[PDB]
Amino acid sequence: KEITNALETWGALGQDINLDIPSFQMSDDIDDIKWEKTSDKKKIAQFRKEKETFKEKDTYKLFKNGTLKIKHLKTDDQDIYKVSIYDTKGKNVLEKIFDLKIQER
Numbered sequence: 001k002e003i004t005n006a007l008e009t010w011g012a013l014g015q016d017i018n019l020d021i022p023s024f025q026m027s028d029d030i031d032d033i034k035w036e037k038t039s040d041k042k043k044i045a046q047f048r049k050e051k052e053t054f055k056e057k058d059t060y061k062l063f064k065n066g067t068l069k070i071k072h073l074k075t076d077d078q079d080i081y082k083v084s085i086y087d088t089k090g091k092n093v094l095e096k097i098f099d100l101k102i103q104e105r
Contacts, residue, residue: 012102033047038082045068059071
């Protein structure tokens with residue numbers, strides 16, 4: 001089996017979870033926080049500076065400082081993710097793989 005660089009990130013049907021990156025160092029200028037798909041390769045929501053902001057409904061909606069809020073899930077509300085973070089200029093800094101998964105207990 002090919003082993004990913006991903007966090008298994010858990011929640012049972014009908015709940016609130018955030019998609020939230022580590023406390024990595026910043027020098028001068030950081031703006032965009034994108035959450036896209038692994039299997040499709042597809043920017044479902046993404047944030048920048050009042051210029052191309054994909055954001056949709058409250059069930060998958062990405063915070064401005066650098067976070068996400070999934071407000072009310074289920075099996076059809078979730079997906080597998082990869083984060084990519086870009087500056088005020090647009091230069092790829094922090095990139096890391098992720099997975100919203102559903103509990104079976």
